[PDB]
Subunit: 92 residues, 6 copies
C-alpha cells in the first residue's frame, strides 16, 4: 500500500503520541520521524488508502492535546514517483 499519511507537531512528544495513535488505528507502517528544524517534528506512515485515512484522523485527534500540539495532518493517497525520492523508507 503506497498511500502516505503525515502529521507535523511542535515538539517530539506530540509526534510520538501521533505515531502511536496512527499505528494503533489501522494497518500502517511508520516510515520516518524527521526533526525539521525550529521545533517542528514530522511523522510519516504508509499503507492502503483506507488505512492511512483512519490513521491520520486518529493521530490528529490524539496529538492535538499533547505538549505544544498539532501543526498539520495530511494525506496523499498516491504520491508522484518523484516524491518517493525524498520519503524515508525506514525510520532511525
Amino acid at each position: 500500500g503506497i498511500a502516505l499519511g503525515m502529521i507535523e507537531t511542535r515538539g517530539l512528544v506530540p509526534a510520538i503520541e501521533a505515531a502511536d495513535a496512527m499505528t494503533k488505528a489501522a494497518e500502517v507502517r511508520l516510515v520516518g520521524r524527521q526533526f525539521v528544524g525550529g521545533g517542528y517534528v514530522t511523522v510519516l506512515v504508509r499503507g492502503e488508502t483506507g488505512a492511512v485515512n483512519a490513521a491520520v484522523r486518529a493521530g490528529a485527534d490524539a496529538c492535538e492535546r499533547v505538549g505544544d500540539g498539532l501543526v498539520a495532518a495530511h494525506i496523499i493517497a498516491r504520491v508522484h514517483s518523484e516524491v518517493e525520492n525524498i520519503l524515508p523508507k525506514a525510520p532511525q
Copy 2:
C-alpha cells in the same frame, strides 16, 4: 531542461504537498528537499521553462492550505552556471 522552480514552506508537511503537486503538474524532476533551519523547508525542481512555470504555480496553490503554509514560490528560468554549484543534483 535547466529551469529551476522552488517552493519554501514552514514545516515539512506543506513541502511534501508542494513537491507532489509540482511533480504531478508538469514534467519536472525533484532535485532536492532542504531543511534550512528555523523550520523553513525548501523543495527544488528542474525542467523546461513552461513545465517549471506550471509546476511552481500548482505547488504554491496546493501547499498554501497545508500546515503552517507557504513562504516563497519562485522560478529562475536559467540560473547562472555559478549557481549550479549550490543546487542539489539528486535528492536524499
Copy 3:
C-alpha cells in the same frame, strides 16, 4: 517493562532535572535525551506502567520551575511495535 514516559522542556537544564526526578521517583530506565530543534529537549524513560506513572509525575513537578520550564509530560503504557523503531534504546 515497556511503558514509555516522556517529558519535553524548553532548554536542556530543565530536561536534566526532569531526568533526575523521574529516575529517582521509580524504577525506570533513561533511554534517551533528544535535542529536537528550536530549543525543545525531550527525555524518555521505560519501565513498568506503575513506575512510569510515578516517574513522569515526579519529573513534571520538578522541571516546571527550572529555566524556561515544561512543555509536555506524557505516558504511553504500551506503544505499538511500529513506534519502537523511532524510540532510542540507549542514551548517548
Copy 4:
C-alpha cells in the same frame, strides 16, 4: 580578485535568487551558501571591488521581494588575512 560580497536572507529561496542576481550582474565567483541557523541563509561571492559592488547591489534589489526577504547586504573590499580562515573557498 579578493573583495567579498555577502547577502543574508530569511530562508533559502531568496538566497538562491540573490546568488543568481549577483553572479549575473558582474564577474564574481560564488564561494559559499551557509545555513546559519534560525532560518538565516548567507551567500558569499568573491571578485574585484567594482564587480563585487555591482553584484551585491543587484542581489539585494532582487532578493528583497522573494519569500521572507533580505536581512543584510554588505561588502568588504579586502578582508584581513585572518578572516580568510572562516570564508569558504568552494561551495557544496
Copy 5:
C-alpha cells in the same frame, strides 16, 4: 566529587562567561558545553557539593549581564546513576 552544576544561556558568549566565573569560583571541572538548539547553550560542571554551590552562584551573577543573558542556574548534588548516561564526561 559528583555534584552537578548547570547554567543555560541565550547565546554562546554568556555561556563562556558563566564557565569562566564558575571555574574561577571553586574547584569544579568543566565537563561540557552543549548547543541545545534555538540559541540555548548549556555549560556543565562537576565537583564536590560546596564547590558546585559556590560555582553556580558565581556563574549566574556573572553571565546575567552578558549578551542575551541567563536562562537557568541549577544544581543537582547527586544525580541518579541513570542520569550519568546523558552527561558529558569531557568537553569538546
Copy 6:
C-alpha cells in the same frame, strides 16, 4: 597572548564584519566562528590584553550596523585553564 575577545551577532554577515574589524584593529588571531543555533553566530579572537580590548571595541562598533546586528561584545583577559577545553584553537 591568551586574552579572549568574543562578539555574538544575529546572523553570519555581521559576524564576518566583526571578525574583519577586530583583526584589522589590533594584533589578534581569529580562533573560531561558531554557529550557535537560533541564528546566533559567535566569533572568537585571542591576543594580548591591550590588543583584545582594542579589537573587541572596533568589532562591536562595526557590526552593530550590519544586518540584524550585535548581541554581545565581551572580553575575558585570562580564562581559567578549564575554559580552554571549550575554546576552538583554529577556525574551520
